[PDB]
Design a protein around this ligand. Structure first.
Ligand code: CL
Lengths: 107, 107
């Protein structure tokens, strides 16, 4: 079961949050992270293409985010305004997909 | 910008509608069509790989839909439950994916 675990779930301003991904499907082709609860190109933060290791900053990239080969997302220098949901879409080799949404708060 | 045109917009019960995708990205590799306004696995009608022409139905598949290589979706023998929004995601080789939503109305 594809899940996101926020580490930590509630963070202090200026610190970091890692959105750790568990149970990726077999045969992923790559990943995209989105701000909010829904896949939406305008809210795309960053992605990753496995075959050529291409990293793809999106319109919601804020120069604080790193995506790891295991699909996890690191956000540095978090603020109260980052509080909310984040959505991962995994594209599989056959171009079918899975989506999962997590969240964290900053105080 | 990717946009969806329904033709006709007003579709009589029992007749057919064609959803056309305008301004497809050049590096497209596949498509997914969803019922409603968002990418959502529970609403996937059909996924499609351009290169193999392989269509994969999802939970919203009715047996009345046909997806074509230019992403157009024909829906036949429409019913009142078909009415509303449809959302296309175009999967690209860099996975910088694009979405567009269209609509028709059954009468
Ligand atoms: Cl027509």
């Amino acid at each position: 079961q594809l899940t996101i675990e926020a580490v930590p779930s509630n963070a202090a301003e200026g610190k970091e949050v890692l959105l750790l991904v568990h149970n990726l499907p077999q045969d992923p082709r790559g990943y995209n992270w989105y701000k909010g609860e829904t896949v939406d190109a305008n809210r795309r933060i960053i992605g990753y293409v496995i075959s050529n290791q291409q990293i793809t900053p999106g319109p919601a990239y804020s120069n604080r985010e790193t995506i790891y080969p295991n699909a996890s997302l690191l956000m540095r220098n978090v603020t109260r305004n980052d509080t909310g949901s984040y959505t991962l879409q995994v594209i599989k080799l056959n171009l079918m997909s899975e989506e999962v949404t997590g969240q964290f708060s900053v105080h | 910008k990717l946009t969806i045109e329904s033709t006709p917009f007003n579709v009589a019960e029992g007749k057919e509608v064609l959803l056309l995708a305008h301004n497809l990205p050049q590096n497209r590799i596949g498509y997914s069509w969803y019922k409603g306004e968002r990418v959502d696995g529970n609403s996937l009608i059909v996924g499609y790989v351009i290169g193999t022409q392989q269509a994969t139905p999802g939970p919203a598949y009715s047996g009345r839909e046909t997806i074509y290589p230019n992403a157009s979706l024909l829906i036949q023998n429409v019913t009142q439950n078909d009415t509303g929004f449809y959302t296309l995601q175009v999967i690209k080789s860099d996975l910088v994916n694009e979405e567009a939503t269209g609509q028709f109305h059954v009468y």
